[PDB]
Structures are given as C-alpha cells and as structure tokens.
Amino acid sequence: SHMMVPCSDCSNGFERGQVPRVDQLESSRGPYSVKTINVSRLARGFGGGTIHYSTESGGQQGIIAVVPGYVSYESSIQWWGPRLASWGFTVITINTNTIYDQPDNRAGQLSAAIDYVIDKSKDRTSPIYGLVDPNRVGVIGWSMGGGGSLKLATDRKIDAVIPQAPWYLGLNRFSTITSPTMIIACQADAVAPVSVHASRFYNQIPRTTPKAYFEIALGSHFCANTGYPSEDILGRNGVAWMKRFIDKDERYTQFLCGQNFDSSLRVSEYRDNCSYY
Ligand SMILES: [Cl-]
Ligand code: NA
Ligand code: NA
C-alpha cells in the first residue's frame, strides 16, 4: 500500500473542522493556510498549473481539478484554488495543452490533472505525500471547461462537479449524470446563452442527482471568474458544495437548502432539488 496520513481534524467520517458561519464561507479564505506547488507544462496529459493544499488538518483530503475555457489561461479560474484549499481540499488549477482545446479534450485533461495529484501523493519527495484520498474527487470548469467537467462526470466516478458558464455542443450523456452538480450560470451570457447551455444542462440531469442552478443577475460569460464581483457568494456555495459532496459533510446542507438565494438582487435565479440531498 501507499502511506496515507489520517485526518486529525475529522469526525463522523470525513467531516473536517468546525461548522462555520456564513460570513466565513463568504470570506476569501477558510480556516487553513494555503501552500502551493507549481506544476510545469511538462506534466503528463495537461498544460501544468498550480497545486494548492493545506496540512494543519492532516490527510484524507478530497482532490479537485479546475479548468479554464477556450482561448483562456489558469488565471481565469485560479480563485477556486486557494479558496477551496483553505477549506481542506487539495486543488489543482490548470492550463490546458493548448488554449484551443475543445470540451471533450478538456475533460481528459481534468482527469489527467486528478491523476497527477494522486501520483504526487505517492511520491515521498512531494509535500502532498499521503495527504489525499484518491477515492474522493471533484472538478470545476469554465465555459468549454464547464462542458468538459460535465462530460468527465459521465466517464469517471466524480463526487462533485461545478460547471461555470458551461458550453457544450452535440450529443451528450448529461441525462445520466449521478455526480452532484452545481451549475453557475451568468444571466446575460452571450457566449454560452443560458437558454441553450447552462439551464438546459441543469434540466437534463436526473432528479435524484443532487443539483443546483446558481444564476448571477446581469452576468456576462466571465461572471464567475477570478476577480469578478460574486466571488464571495459563488465561493460560499462552492465551498459548501464540495464540503457536502466530496467530504459527505452533512453539516453543510444547511448552507445550500432553504435559503431563497434569488431574493437578492445579485442572484437572478436559484434552482435546487434539496429534497434529494
Ligand atoms: Cl457575454
Ligand atoms: Na503537458
Ligand atoms: Na434576485
């Protein structure tokens, strides 16, 4: 076997840390200090990126890979890295092999990036040696990368998916997705119109699969990217989503359900099937 460091801040399975306040979830950082490892483009199967991780709480950490869109780089999605790592996930934000790569290719690169992290967790020279649980993985993607994230869920066992402003064209198996999926939609999107992409994909996913549709009022296609004005609230729901579905931490259902999120002028629509969480 490979050495795995126990979680030393866990109970009730993988429930890590204390229950936060909503304002803590909305903050730019959770309770843990974020460390980073640069991954060069020489990495197998993707264009490199950055591993974000924390060590205070020990191991058994879920793994998350995050991918950008067409003609875009890691910075567009990088905010998810430190945000989620600060809550006890090992998170790799990536560049793609080329910026022109299409959704199904981006799905394979998310898969490769997960596997890269797993491989490093078995490498005695890596800071993340023994830190991760290869059995608990999630993905996040923007635009064509969001399409890729949904595609990957149909090809690999994925514990949680966050497609943001997703774009996908053609035949798909989204009608069979069993991974808990939180779609972030940008209301005014002219690149991946929600009526064609995000909303349709949400509606396809099985009723028994936990899901959410978080639509940012007036948002452009870029509305969920690094530095945009909804990092606070998108990150609140995203951290809760990954806690609930990667860590199986049911203390976090309260942050996702019964909230009437679209009462805020910032949120044009919120859908969920909370009765199936
Ligand atoms: Cl747009
Ligand atoms: Na590479
Ligand atoms: Na609203």
Numbering used by the authors: 21 to 297
Q: Which lines from the publication concern this structure?
A:
From a previous study that identified new PETase candidates by homology search, we chose the candidate PET6 from the globally distributed, halophilic organism Vibrio gazogenes for further investigation. 24 This enzyme is found in the proteobacteria Vibrio gazogenes from the genus Vibrio, whose members are ubiquitously present in saline and marine environments. The biochemical characterization of PET6 showed that PET6 has a comparatively lower activity than other enzymes but also revealed a superior turnover at very high salt concentrations. Sodium and chloride ions stabilize the protein and decisively promote its activity.
